[PDB]
Design an enzyme around this catalytic site. Structure first.
Site, PDB file in Angstrom:
ATOM      1  N   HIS A  37      22.411  26.548 -33.024  1.00 15.64           N
ATOM      2  CA  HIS A  37      22.033  27.899 -32.600  1.00 15.64           C
ATOM      3  C   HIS A  37      22.905  28.863 -33.376  1.00 15.64           C
ATOM      4  O   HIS A  37      23.907  28.440 -33.941  1.00 15.64           O
ATOM      5  CB  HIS A  37      22.334  28.172 -31.111  1.00 15.64           C
ATOM      6  CG  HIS A  37      21.544  27.324 -30.120  1.00 15.64           C
ATOM      7  ND1 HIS A  37      20.298  27.676 -29.858  1.00 15.64           N
ATOM      8  CD2 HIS A  37      21.980  26.256 -29.375  1.00 15.64           C
ATOM      9  CE1 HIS A  37      19.916  26.823 -28.912  1.00 15.64           C
ATOM     10  NE2 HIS A  37      20.915  26.007 -28.645  1.00 15.64           N
ATOM     11  N   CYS A  87      19.555  34.554 -30.906  1.00 22.85           N
ATOM     12  CA  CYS A  87      19.732  33.390 -31.752  1.00 22.85           C
ATOM     13  C   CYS A  87      18.604  33.454 -32.772  1.00 22.85           C
ATOM     14  O   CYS A  87      17.477  33.548 -32.300  1.00 22.85           O
ATOM     15  CB  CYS A  87      19.591  32.110 -30.918  1.00 22.85           C
ATOM     16  SG  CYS A  87      19.526  30.651 -31.975  1.00 22.85           S
ATOM     17  N   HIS A  90      15.624  30.656 -32.299  1.00 27.84           N
ATOM     18  CA  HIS A  90      14.940  30.657 -31.001  1.00 27.84           C
ATOM     19  C   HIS A  90      14.695  32.038 -30.423  1.00 27.84           C
ATOM     20  O   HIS A  90      14.414  32.209 -29.229  1.00 27.84           O
ATOM     21  CB  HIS A  90      15.759  29.770 -30.021  1.00 27.84           C
ATOM     22  CG  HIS A  90      16.024  28.336 -30.516  1.00 27.84           C
ATOM     23  ND1 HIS A  90      17.246  27.955 -30.836  1.00 27.84           N
ATOM     24  CD2 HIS A  90      15.126  27.317 -30.688  1.00 27.84           C
ATOM     25  CE1 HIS A  90      17.176  26.700 -31.229  1.00 27.84           C
ATOM     26  NE2 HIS A  90      15.904  26.349 -31.122  1.00 27.84           N
ATOM     27  N   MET A  95      15.790  33.681 -26.502  1.00 31.28           N
ATOM     28  CA  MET A  95      17.195  33.338 -26.409  1.00 31.28           C
ATOM     29  C   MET A  95      18.017  34.536 -26.958  1.00 31.28           C
ATOM     30  O   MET A  95      18.353  34.708 -28.143  1.00 31.28           O
ATOM     31  CB  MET A  95      17.480  32.083 -27.202  1.00 31.28           C
ATOM     32  CG  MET A  95      18.901  31.627 -27.159  1.00 31.28           C
ATOM     33  SD  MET A  95      19.225  30.005 -27.863  1.00 31.28           S
ATOM     34  CE  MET A  95      20.958  29.870 -27.621  1.00 31.28           C
TER      35      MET A  95
HETATM   36 CU   LIG Z   1      19.041  28.945 -30.581  1.00 30.55          CU
END
Ligand SMILES: [Cu+2]
Length: 102
Positions: A37, A87, A90, A95
């Site tokens: 991430h 992130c 994502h 996220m």
């Molecule tokens: Cu992520």
């Protein structure tokens, strides 16, 4: 302040996703689990150039991912305000988190 990035189950979440810190307090993001991430700050529209530069310096390069080899990232923001971070892989899975600097 400490923020956990992801978990052992592979959810795309920051833990917690809202943090309040004092000016210049480091926020240490630490990877949990095996999904990589990263953390990139959104730059508010019309932000002054000093804030835009702080937020860029507090962001991971989007060609960078936390891994258990590179498990943490530390960001410092001095200007009072609330800022969103997300992130890159994502982002469409929401996220994201908020950082309030007092
Ligand atoms: Cu992520």
């Amino acid at each position: 302040a400490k923020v956990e990035v992801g978990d052992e189950v592979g959810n795309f979440k920051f833990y917690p996703d809202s943090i309040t810190v004092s000016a210049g307090e480091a926020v240490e993001f630490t990877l949990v689990g095996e999904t990589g991430h990263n953390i990139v700050f959104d730059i508010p529209a019309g932000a002054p150039g000093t804030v835009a530069s702080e937020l860029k310096a507090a962001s991971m390069d989007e060609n960078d991912l936390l891994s258990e080899d590179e498990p943490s990232f530390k960001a410092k923001v001095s200007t009072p305000g609330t800022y969103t971070f997300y992130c890159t892989p994502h982002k469409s899975a929401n996220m994201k988190g908020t950082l309030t600097v007092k």
